[PDB]
Amino acid sequence: TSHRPQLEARSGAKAAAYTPTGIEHARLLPGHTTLKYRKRSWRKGTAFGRGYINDMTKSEYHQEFLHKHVR
Amino acid sequence: IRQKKARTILQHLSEAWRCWKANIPWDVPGMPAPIKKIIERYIKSKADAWVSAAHYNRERIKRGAHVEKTMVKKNLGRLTRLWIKNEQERQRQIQKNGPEITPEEATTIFSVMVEWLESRSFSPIPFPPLTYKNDTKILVLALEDLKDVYASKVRLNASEREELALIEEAYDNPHDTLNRIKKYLLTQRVFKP
Amino acid sequence: RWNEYLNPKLNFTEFSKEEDAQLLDLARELPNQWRTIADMMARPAQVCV
Amino acid sequence: ALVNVEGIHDLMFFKPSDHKYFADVISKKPIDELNKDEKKERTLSMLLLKIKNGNTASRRT
Amino acid sequence: FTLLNRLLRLIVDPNIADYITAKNNVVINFKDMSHVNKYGLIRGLKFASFIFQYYGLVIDLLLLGQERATDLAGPANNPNEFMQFKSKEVEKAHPIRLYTRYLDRIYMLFHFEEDEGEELTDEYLAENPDPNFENSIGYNNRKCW
Amino acid sequence: KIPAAVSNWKNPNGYTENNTINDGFMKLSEALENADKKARQ
RNA sequence: ACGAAUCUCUUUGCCUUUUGGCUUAGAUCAAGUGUAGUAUCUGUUCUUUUCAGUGUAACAACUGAAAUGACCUAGGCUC
C-alpha cells in the first residue's frame, strides 16, 4: 500500500539552492540552442476422392504465433 | 469512506489478475456491478500489455538478439500460460460445436481399414496371456528403458527417488509386478493427472 | 484427495432413476471417456465408473 | 489369478501357492456360512495369512 | 477418441483398446491451470507412438487406395521389402511408384506420360482456371541451391 | 457495499459448467456402431 | 391517563489492520527399521424368570434344563 506519492514541493523548498547542489549532469549540458519558428483407373481407387476482433488472445495473429513457436 | 474500503478494493484487483493468469473466471457474488466493470476493464488492459510484450520478446529470442537469462526464462513462463489458454479454448469449442468428422466420413474410414485387414488376414493381438513364457523378456526391456533416465543423475528430488524405488521393487519381485499390470489393464479406467 | 474425495462440493449421493438413464446414454456415445462423462453428470469420475 | 477376493492392502505380496493353502479368504461366500465354528475357521486362516505375508503392524498383532 | 476406440477394436483385445482410450482422457496440469484433455493424442504416453502409426496407416490407405497399397506391400503371405515389387508389370501399373511416410511427412514419386500428364492438368485448369498466369507465384522451391 | 477479499492464492497472517452434449457426438457413435455390426456380420 | 426525565434490556442504523505491493502460482526443497511389551479415547453389544454344576475374597462370568390361571386389600400358614 503506497497510498500516496511524494509531493514535489517538499524537495523544492529545501535550502541547498534554487538550483541543485552544483552537480553538473551530462544531459543538462548545452545543446539544440536555436529555437525554430514556423512561417483414369488410378483416379478412382480411393475412398474420399472427388474480421478484426478486439481481443489479443482470440485473434488470428496470436494463433499463428502459437502455431509457429510451440511447434 | 476512503481509507478502509481502499485496501479491500486493491486486493480484488490482484486477485482478478491471478485469475486471468490461471484461466479461471473471476466471480465475486456480492460485488456491485460498476466496481466489477472497472476492474474488468483494467485487467484487460494489463493483459493486453502482457501478451504483446511476450510476442515482442519471443521474436528477439528467435532472431538471435541478445536477451538476458532472466528474461529468456520469464518469456517461456508467459508462453506456457498463453499456450494452455489456446489449448483450453480449443477443447471448449469441440464440446460446443461438436466433432469435425461427419458420420459419413467416419463410416468410410472404418470400412477402409476392415477391407485392408480382411485382405491381410490379420490375426489380432490378444491380451497378455496366462501362460506366456515371454512375459519376463518384455519386463526386462520396459524396466531398463525406465531405468536409463537415472544413469546420469546425481541429485534426485522426492519424486525421482519414489520412481526408482518402484523399479527396484519390480526387479525384486517380478511376478507380483506382472499381476499388478494385468489388474490395471482389466479394471483401471480413471487415471491421475 | 481434495479433488476426488474431500471437497464438500462433490456429489457422492445415490443416483436417481433419471441419472442412470443419463449414464447409460453417455457411456454409449463416448465409450470410455470417463472424465468427459463425469463433467456432464457433475459427479466424480470413479463413482460414475 | 489377480483380483479374486483378498485383502489387497495389508499383504506385502500374494503368491500363486497362497491360493491353495489359505483359499477361504480367496473364496467368495460372504454370508450363510456354517454356524460360528466356521467363522472361527476363517479367522485362523486370517491370522496365518497376516503372520506370513502381512506387514510388520499386521504381523505383530 | 470415439473413432480411435472403434479402429483399435479391430486389431487388439477390447480390454487393451479400452485402457488405451481411457488413458488419453486425463487432466492436464500446469501449476494452477487445469483442464481435461477431451480430444487429441497425448504424446507423452509410452504407447503413444503405436497409436500414431496405426492412425497414420489409415491416411496411407486413403492416399494410395486398396489396389495400389496391395501392390507396394506385396501379398500377405510373401510381402515385399521396402521399394521391392514382384514384377515390373506391377511396378508400372500405376503412376505412383514409390511411397514412404516418416511419422508426419509423406513422400510420393509419380511418373507420368504426356497422355496421363495432360489429362490431370486439364482437369485442374478446368476447375481452377488461371488466365492471368499467376501459378508461378507462391510455388515453393528450394532456396539453398 | 464491497465484499471482503478472500484469496485462494495468499493467506494473511491474521484472521486465518452447464452445457449438454452436442448432437454431432450422438450421431457419430450411432454411425460407427452400425458400421461395426454390419462389418462383423 | 398524560407532559416528562434517568438507570436496565431488545430490535434498526453505525462499525472496527473485513491481506503492505510487484514477477518466472518469483523459485526450489521435505516422513528409517526391527524385537518385546504398557497406557489412553470412541463406536458397538448386555433380549431373562428359578435351579444345578463350575467359578470368585465375595461377586460376576461361563455350562445345562424348564411356569402359567383364579382372587382380596406392597402384602397371602391362599388354591
UniProtKB/Swiss-Prot annotation, chain A:
<comment type="function">
    <text>Involved in pre-mRNA splicing.</text>
</comment>
<dbReference type="InterPro" id="IPR006973">
    <property type="entry name" value="Cwf_Cwc_15"/>
</dbReference>
<protein>
    <recommendedName>
        <fullName>Pre-mRNA-splicing factor CWC15</fullName>
    </recommendedName>
</protein>
<comment type="subunit">
    <text>Belongs to the CWC complex (or CEF1-associated complex), a spliceosome sub-complex reminiscent of a late-stage spliceosome composed of the U2, U5 and U6 snRNAs and at least BUD13, BRR2, CDC40, CEF1, CLF1, CUS1, CWC2, CWC15, CWC21, CWC22, CWC23, CWC24, CWC25, CWC27, ECM2, HSH155, IST3, ISY1, LEA1, MSL1, NTC20, PRP8, PRP9, PRP11, PRP19, PRP21, PRP22, PRP45, PRP46, SLU7, SMB1, SMD1, SMD2, SMD3, SMX2, SMX3, SNT309, SNU114, SPP2, SYF1, SYF2, RSE1 and YJU2.</text>
</comment>
<feature type="region of interest" description="Disordered">
    <location>
        <begin position="1"/>
        <end position="18"/>
    </location>
</feature>
<dbReference type="Pfam" id="PF04889">
    <property type="entry name" value="Cwf_Cwc_15"/>
</dbReference>
<comment type="similarity">
    <text>Belongs to the CWC15 family.</text>
</comment>
From Swiss-Prot, chain C:
<comment type="subunit">
    <text>Belongs to the NTC complex (or PRP19-associated complex), composed of at least CEF1, CLF1, ISY1, NTC20, SNT309, SYF1, SYF2, and PRP19.</text>
</comment>
<feature type="domain" description="HTH myb-type 2">
    <location>
        <begin position="13"/>
        <end position="49"/>
    </location>
</feature>
<comment type="function">
    <text>Involved in pre-mRNA splicing and cell cycle control. Required for the binding of the NTC complex (or PRP19-associated complex) components to the spliceosome to mediate conformational rearrangement or to stabilize the structure of the spliceosome after U4 snRNA dissociation, which leads to spliceosome maturation. Its absence leads to an arrest of the cell cycle, possibly due to the inefficient splicing of TUB1.</text>
</comment>
<protein>
    <recommendedName>
        <fullName>Pre-mRNA-splicing factor CEF1</fullName>
    </recommendedName>
</protein>
<feature type="DNA-binding region" description="H-T-H motif">
    <location>
        <begin position="34"/>
        <end position="49"/>
    </location>
</feature>
<comment type="similarity">
    <text>Belongs to the CEF1 family.</text>
</comment>
